[PDB]
Amino acid sequence: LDPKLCYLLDGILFIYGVILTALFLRVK
Amino acid sequence: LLDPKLCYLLDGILFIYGVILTALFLRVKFS
Amino acid sequence: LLDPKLCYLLDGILFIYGVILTALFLRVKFS
Amino acid sequence: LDPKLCYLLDGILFIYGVILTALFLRVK
Amino acid sequence: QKVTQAQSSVSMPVRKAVTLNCLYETSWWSYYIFWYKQLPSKEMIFLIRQGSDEQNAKSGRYSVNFKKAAKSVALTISALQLEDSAKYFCALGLNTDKLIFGKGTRVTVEPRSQPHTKPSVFVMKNGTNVACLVKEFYPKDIRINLVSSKKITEFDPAIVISPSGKYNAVKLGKYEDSNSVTCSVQHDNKTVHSTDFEVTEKVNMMSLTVLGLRMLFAKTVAVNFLLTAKLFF
Amino acid sequence: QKVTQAQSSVSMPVRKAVTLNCLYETSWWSYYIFWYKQLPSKEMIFLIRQGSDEQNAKSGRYSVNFKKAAKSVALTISALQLEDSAKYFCALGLNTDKLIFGKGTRVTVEPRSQPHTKPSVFVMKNGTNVACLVKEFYPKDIRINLVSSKKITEFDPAIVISPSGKYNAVKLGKYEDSNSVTCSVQHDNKTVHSTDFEVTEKVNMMSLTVLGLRMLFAKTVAVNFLLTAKLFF
Amino acid sequence: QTPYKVSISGTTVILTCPQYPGSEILWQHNDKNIGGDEDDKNIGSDEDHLSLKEFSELEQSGYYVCYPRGSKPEDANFYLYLRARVCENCMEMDVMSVATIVIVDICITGGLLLLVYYWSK
Amino acid sequence: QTPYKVSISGTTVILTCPQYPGSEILWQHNDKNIGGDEDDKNIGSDEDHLSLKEFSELEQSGYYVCYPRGSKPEDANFYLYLRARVCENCMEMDVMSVATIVIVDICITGGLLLLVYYWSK
Amino acid sequence: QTPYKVSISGTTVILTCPQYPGSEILWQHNDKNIGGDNIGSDEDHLSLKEFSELEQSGYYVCYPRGSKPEDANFYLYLRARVCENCMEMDVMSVATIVIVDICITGGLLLLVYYWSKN
Amino acid sequence: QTPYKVSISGTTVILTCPQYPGSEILWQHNDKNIGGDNIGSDEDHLSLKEFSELEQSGYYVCYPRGSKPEDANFYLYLRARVCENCMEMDVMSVATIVIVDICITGGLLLLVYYWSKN
Amino acid sequence: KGNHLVKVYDYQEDGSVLLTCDAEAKNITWFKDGKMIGFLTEDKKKWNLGSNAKDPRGMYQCKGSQNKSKPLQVYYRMCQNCIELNAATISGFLFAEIVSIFVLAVGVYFIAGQD
Amino acid sequence: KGNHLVKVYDYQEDGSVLLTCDAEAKNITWFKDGKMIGFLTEDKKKWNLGSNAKDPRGMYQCKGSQNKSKPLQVYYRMCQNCIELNAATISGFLFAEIVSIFVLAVGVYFIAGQD
Amino acid sequence: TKSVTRPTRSSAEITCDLTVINAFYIHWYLHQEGKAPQRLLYYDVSNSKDVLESGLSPGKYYTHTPRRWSWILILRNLIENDSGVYYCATWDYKKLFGSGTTLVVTDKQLDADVSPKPTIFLPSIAETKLQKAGTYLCLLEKFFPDVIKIHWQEKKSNTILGSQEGNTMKTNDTYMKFSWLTVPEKSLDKEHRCIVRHENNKNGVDQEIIFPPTLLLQLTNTSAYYMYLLLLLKSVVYFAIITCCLLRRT
Amino acid sequence: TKSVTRPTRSSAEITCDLTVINAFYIHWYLHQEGKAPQRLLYYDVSNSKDVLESGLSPGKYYTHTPRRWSWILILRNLIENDSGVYYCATWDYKKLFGSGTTLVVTDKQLDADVSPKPTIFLPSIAETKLQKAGTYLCLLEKFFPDVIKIHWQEKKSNTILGSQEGNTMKTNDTYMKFSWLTVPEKSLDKEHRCIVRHENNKNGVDQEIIFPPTLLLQLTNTSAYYMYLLLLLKSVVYFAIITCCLLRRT
Amino acid sequence: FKIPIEELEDRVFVNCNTSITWVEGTVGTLLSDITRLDLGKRILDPRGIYRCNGTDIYKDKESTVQVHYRMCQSCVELDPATVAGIIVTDVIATLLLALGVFCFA
Amino acid sequence: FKIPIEELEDRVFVNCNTSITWVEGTVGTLLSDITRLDLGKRILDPRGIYRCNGTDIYKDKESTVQVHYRMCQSCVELDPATVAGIIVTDVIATLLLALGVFCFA
């Protein structure tokens, strides 16, 4: 349970980073 | 073994980057 | 006890009202 | 079974009365 | 040295008396005469002993009549019973001596006088063996014939004295069908077959309160409908 | 009709030969001489039979020397073994006839020549009974004395031939203390007492490799994002 | 013969003895006096009444003979047999006594509305 | 007193005996000689070294006394007790020795990009 | 002093006597001894399964071993009537669903009022 | 000659000795006789269920009846560590999902490239 | 008895319980939880608690002319306010709380649409 | 023994196995599957196979001064490359292979839309 | 009493049960059919010698003492005219006798098993109402020595029941007997036995034949009392909504 | 072979085990200490009569045939000079003998129980290392007729073990024997027996003396090692796509 | 001389020694044996006057007994807190319903 | 005179006959009984110099023992094929990431 949480913490962190890069870059 | 503490060293790096782009995106959206 | 016969005294009143409005609604729809 | 039927007879009677009032009143 | 008993069998009824004879013959000057009885299970029981020098010996229900001038001695069994059915021996007779026995007489004791009763027969089977059972009856004139078209064997009846003083009899017989066989009896001029034997004060308030809440809800629906209709006109 | 055997005992070692003598005496014209042996469990076994009209009878390891002019007959047991330790009888002798036996001679067979070995004694108790046990030793000159200040009984030793061809001996003895008793042996000029016998490195690499693949994937996402952004400007 | 009207209201049970309305009455219960004994002041007689309070189904349920003055107790030719599940604040009410309140509630709710409608001139 | 620095690299275990740096040393192991025996050529001494290869946790794990020439073996007042899970191509590395490679990887990946950016004039 | 705590979960009654923490205690019911092995006599718990009213309703006495039951603290009197998978609405679940029903009705009709005025 | 074939399905080990097709054979394990009725001694199969490592790991000898086990062909040495409903990725399932992953990624992104250029 | 005097009389036609202090004295003084919540005169012996349908709990005791008695914790779960939470009440609770909210919301839509 | 000489020594602190040819001779000559895959000098007696974590299979034998011994098929499933295919790995394999393909396809849509 | 069934030209052991301490002479009598009991011999016990009769040579009768105060008469070279009942006797006066032992001397004409074989019966169905009783019947057959004793016992007791036997009728070469018992009313459905003592039984032990004989309405009124009190706190919320929306027009 | 221990002025039964079909004469021999085996008598079996020796009157020896082809010699009025070993014999030539039966005639000088009473021993502790073996010892005592047979058997087998007895030494009025056995190394901790055959052994059955002797982390690191190697062969496919789409602009 | 009113599980009998002649009330049933009467169920409330005659000890005396029962299971426990909290809000609901009818006309 | 280092399931003890005086190293704990010392866990790597005094046989001799342990469970098995195949592609990924940064500016 505790080793498995870090492998779906990085998933929501990858998807949140990609979404907030793609939506930040729409400024031009 | 050293696995459980070692795995969160990347997910304290992606949190830094995620809060950096949320702090950069809130600036270029309201102002 | 008097519960089973007593409960249907309201559902013979709502049937009266329901058939009154169906008889009033069929009149004001066709004619 | 018999005491329970009168408590879902009044439900269809309430809903049928409300629907046939609301649809009758649309005449104006 | 001879002992003679010229009596084959005797038949005497219950509570009567019986004399048994014994002709001894000897050349001694002082001897004893012993009486023995033999049960059908082959047991010899000493009954009475008559010493030939003093008077007549009696012991309970036994008595001995002694004729010293002749050669006759005689046993009396008074007030007979049902277990006086034995064979009786006369014996003639210090630790080395022998007894000289006679050939023995047999006493068969018959029951008393009873009124006549009726048989009331029954029947019982084991697949091929049958057995007519006859219940109590006093005079011994019985005929226990069976009925079957298919006969193999038929042994004789066995009439025996009951503890009531009457008689019972069993007659076996092996047959094939062994199910439609019914025995009959010709006792005492009247035939006996075997076919006659063959044949709550708060539940009410809770329903009243629920009806009251129904009548309140059907008015709080009406007020809301009437005011929402007022909002549109 | 006499059979004489004036030989009390013989002692002969293994794989040697022995002659036993038997002086018979009779007046018949044709007779037979039988030889029997008796085990210590009291069993008679027929060995050999010498008919007094034809030549010397032999059967296996047995041979009979016959002197018809004299009265001497003689049994030979060649190539001796260990179960030739019995008592031997001479008998003299159609279904009704009897055998006339002699008083019997005893043959006790001794083992062969062996080099001398040493005793190696032990001891074993049952609360009050002791028993010195002596292991294999060839010459029979043994003295199995025990040591106790408190002696009650001491039976004799029992020397018996082992299946190895040497000897074993047990000497019982009952005492009170029965715990501080130690047996000794004086066999073959050298005393033997009994006191000398009395005394997680690949799980870590897998987590390191998975972290390395994470750090590669977070750069192969970055290269693809950076070039797809270049495609739009 | 005339009955003994047993009025049971709440817990109070009132028996009436009209067999001797021109004399002074007493009561009995299992050949033992009750009423006119001037103790346990819930019970108490009148010209014909007898009022029993804190009534129970277990005790005080049997033969209630009411006889006048100068009368041997076994002279009367009437007895009662009262067995009552006397209750606390509860009354007998069947189905027909509830529909007659429902219909009156409908005719007093729906008899006001066409009067408020007629008030509005 | 000065320790016996036990350097365990891979499989090779090197003990240093600096207690007599002005003499010629030997070793022992459970009161039995080792080193300077000129057989099983993996082991071998020096001025202070002792290099044991094909090491095992089971055997060669005990008392390693190092004494100079002309010395009775029970004269020294120091012993070792070495018990080692000597491994094949593996080294001790905790958590803190991996984050210091991750941070250096970030600062050598992200220290090139703002230099390639500055090259482009 | 400290009364017997009784707790009725579903159709199963379970009761505790918190007067002696650690000892060997026994239980009784109209002097019919309950304990020693159906029914369960734990270290301080009694687990009366299938609690039908007409056979288990009376005098329960909790006491350690070696002691007389009449020299104990006190008794209980239990007259429970239990049902299968049911609750008992005190004012903890009838003053909770009434609060959250209004704070879920007003927390939805206001959202519909926003969504409809736009 | 022909070795013992062992096959481990899930947590259940099953092994065969293909040296004698039809006979009455027995099985052993550290001279603890296995066969004759848990565990299963078939005509040439042994079905070791619940194969825990610390009690069943050693010397298995397959041989027909009437023969001495030490006069057989050879032995086995088994040190299996099994798990419940698991696989073991050799290069037959790691060179198959890698092939079909690229031939399902390039077989979808090309379809999106068609659907997007239209 | 052993200083256990209070009993409870039950099994009658009506729903009431009665604490019977089996102790010979005059003027028995009832209690509840250490305090003197009641009192009694003569001519009555069994104190009344009410209905078993109203669940009389507590810890009752009495006192005669001698020393005071030992308690008796009465517990009555004659519930009657029990509801049966099977799969036909919690599934008929998601039909009076979904139809009603949707009728109210299809009303409030029109109310705010009129404004 | 009965011409069964090879044994395997195990149960130690480290992960390695050792084939012990219990046969008195000098210069024991090891094999594997009929061929002479190894050899040995003196001063060492137990041939080494490697780690149990690397799964040593085969059919090993030896040979003394007398005739050659009988084999011993070693089988080691100390797997460590096992993955657990329960309902939380095959259902977390349809979330790294659906999100990734949809991110790649929402990229390729824009790539081809730019052309 | 028992039987002995030796063949011709054999030996027979006849033991007597008469146990007497400090006897001096033990006489031996023989009884045959229609004759008298005659003494064969008598055995001195202080000198251990037999004194025979004036009729036969020695080598026929021998008195054996296996234990102290126990005697067995051994007969030798049995002929068919040796068959009868054998007693042993002692003086004290009177002369006690020793219960008899029948000896049967046959020519080995058995050639099969000669054990008594029961074929038991059950009471009729009509007897068991109009008599308050029932009767068993235990027929035995095919047994040779004819010294047989049938007696009935209870299920668990030591009482002898009132049985009523019959005559040992003879078949062509074997025999046959039957016994039967009537039992009263209230001891009827129990177990009964037909113990049969005989010489040619299996294992020596005599046979033993066993004989048969509302809380539903209370919950659905308050599970619907709480629904209508939760549809009545939504109509008041809606009434507050429409009143607040109507009062802003006044 | 067994023993018989009757007193003086008694009777003794001596049976012989020699089973022979269709014999004609059965001889009887007597062997005493330091004398020769002499014939006492012989029994004709086709006529059933004893033919005695020239020394005693009849009334001493009797040959009894209980069954066909079984013979018992009954002695009568035992005197102390009657004690010895008794054989039975038949012709065929040779003359077979019948294993002996010792008869002891005492004056009832026993006055107690004379059964053999074991007092068994256990191997020493020092024997069980430096010899790889152990030895038992089974001492019997207080038994009168002295015809005793000790033999050792296994825990469950029918083998006779290599025991080594001793001489039947005599106490003041009783006797004493001991037997002992050595067993090898790998058959040591099992059960062994010291079966003792004797006449005055209780219930007739001979004695039988019994002798004592993490996998959770390992799977969740490689189930996520193969996911990141399958998200790294999609980023290379996408890198090839964008590189092929960027190189067409150069 | 009273008239014994004996009890089965639900049958409230009337017993005599001479012929029961009904006067006035719930007749119940008859019964086949004389000097008896069945009144039927306990929860039926049987009530009536039943004169009987004398017995073998107290003859020449006509006796009379009324039977009266109030074993109610048709009764309802009216509370002063859930009746006066249903009426006093139903008058409020009626006066609210008579507000909109004004409000239109 | 050495100092015996005895073993429980995980306790690497230090035993003497006279008072242990710690010199230098991992002190572990103390122990209540004299002439003892506890060093604690096997996987802790206890290491230190602990001089002790003589015994009842080898008295007037101060003895000394160092304890040293390398029972590693913090160690990692570095391979020359999955380290040199992660670094040599991470340099490739870094040089690819430093291509687009050129490609913009």
Residue numbers in the entry:
A (entry chain b), D (entry chain B): 27 to 54
B (entry chain a), C (entry chain A): 26 to 56
E (entry chain M), F (entry chain m): 22 to 114, 119 to 224, 256 to 289
G (entry chain E), H (entry chain e): 33 to 153
I (entry chain F), J (entry chain f): 33 to 69, 74 to 154
K (entry chain G), L (entry chain g): 26 to 140
M (entry chain N), N (entry chain n): 11 to 102, 111 to 231, 252 to 288
O (entry chain D), P (entry chain d): 22 to 126
What did the paper state?
Gamma delta (γδ) T cells, a unique T cell subgroup, are crucial in various immune responses and immunopathology. Each TCRγ or TCRδ contains an extracellular domain (ECD) with a Vγ/Cγ or Vδ/Cδ domain, a membrane-proximal connecting peptide (CP), a transmembrane (TM) helix and a short cytoplasmic tail. After antigen engagement, the γδ TCR–CD3 complex triggers the phosphorylation of ITAMs within the cytoplasmic tails of CD3 subunits, initiating downstream events.
The Vγ5Vδ1 TCR–CD3 complex displays a dimeric architecture, whereby two protomers nestle back to back through the Vγ5 domains of the TCR extracellular domains. Initially, we obtained a nominal 9.5-Å-resolution cryo-EM reconstruction after several cycles of classification and refinement, which enabled us to identify two protomers, denoted I and II. Each protomer consists of an ECD, a membrane-proximal domain (MPD) and a TM domain (TMD) (Fig. 1b (left)). Although the cryo-EM densities for the MPDI–TMDI and MPDII–TMDII were less well resolved, we were able to dock the Vγ9Vδ2 TCR–CD3 structure into the cryo-EM densities based on clear secondary structural elements. The Vγ5Vδ1 TCR–CD3 complex displays a dimeric assembly, comprising two protomers nestled back-to-back through their ECDs, with each MPD and TMD independently embedded in the membrane. Notably, in protomer II, the Cγ5 and Cδ1 domains are aligned vertically with the TMD, whereas, in protomer I, the Cγ5 and Cδ1 domains laterally deviate from the TMD by about 45 Å. MPDI–TMDI and MPDII–TMDII are arranged asymmetrically, with CD3ζIIζ′II facing CD3εI. Our current model suggests that MPDI–TMDI and MPDII–TMDII are positioned at an angle of around 60° relative to each other.
